[PDB]
Amino acid sequence: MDSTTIQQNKDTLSQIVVFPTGNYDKNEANAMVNRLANIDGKYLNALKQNNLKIKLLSGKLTDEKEYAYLKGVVPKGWEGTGKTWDDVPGLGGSTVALRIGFSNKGKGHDAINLELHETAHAIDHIVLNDISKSAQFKQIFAKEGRSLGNVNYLGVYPEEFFAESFAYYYLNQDTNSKLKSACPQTYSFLQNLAK
């Protein structure tokens, strides 16, 4: 990622990202925007075109008014864990909401990076017309969909494998190289999508 392109994408993200009212680590919110800025500018401009907002949160997801309906709701597969959506740090699809500070793997979620994974869902659904459900991607998923691990989740849901692969592709050079090695067809597919 070249520095001038990053700044251009951050400028675009200034028209996408919404910062919260409450108090939060401004430097960490900025770091999240910096990581999002590695996403290909064409996707970012398309999110902006669709008026998609990336809402950064200063607290729990379910303490946001528009997600309060998820209070106490147990996510699929989380039965018996004692955890609920109140414990989920982010979501992506038709909207994007992300708790500041919870980017890294293990911060209440299993993704390599929260904001890239969830924003990938929004790009998939809003920008790319659910390409993760396409026949082309389904063929790739059938072969490579377990190769980032979490086989009972990423390996089962092509939308999740897409989002995680997208996050590997764009997080940093290390994860990008790892994806190329582990999932070469997925890597080529993403490379060509951004052409």
Least distance in Å: CB of 169 to Zn ion? 15
Distance CA 87, CA 74 (A): 10
153 is in an annotated binding site: yes
Residues paired with residue 90 on neighbouring β-strands, in sequence order: 98
Give me the torsion for CA of 74, 76, 81, 86, rounded to 10°.
Answer: -40
CB-closest chain residue to Zn ion: 163
Please say which residue, 109 or 178, places its beta carbon nearer to Zn ion. Answer: 109
Least distance in angstroms from the C-beta of 150 to Zn ion = 10
| Residue 79 bears catalytic tag | no
Q: Does 120 bind Zn ion (CB under 5 A)?
A: no
CB nearer to Zn ion: pick between 37 and 115: 115
State which of positions 139-168 bind Zn ion (CB under 5 A).
160, 163
Give the binding-site size for Zn ion (rule: CB under 5 A).
Answer: 2
Has 160 been labeled as part of a binding site? Answer: yes
The distance of closest approach from Cβ of residue 156 to Zn ion in the complex, given in angstroms and rounded to an integer, is 12
- Cβ-based nearer residue to Zn ion, 10 or 93: 93
Pick the catalytic residue: 66, 79, 115, 118?
A: 118
Site for Zn ion in 13-42 (CB under 5 A): none
Quote the least distance from Cβ 186 to Zn ion, whole Å.
15
Q: At what angle do helices 3-13 and 41-49 cross, to 10 degrees?
A: 10
| Contact predicate 21/53, CB 8 Å | no
Q: Which is nearer to Zn ion, 92 or 101 (CB)?
A: 92
Catalytic residues: 118
Residue set of the binding site: 117, 121, 153, 160
Residues of each annotated binding site for Zn(2+): 117, 121, 153, 160
Binding residues for Zn ion, rule: CB under 5 A, are 160, 163
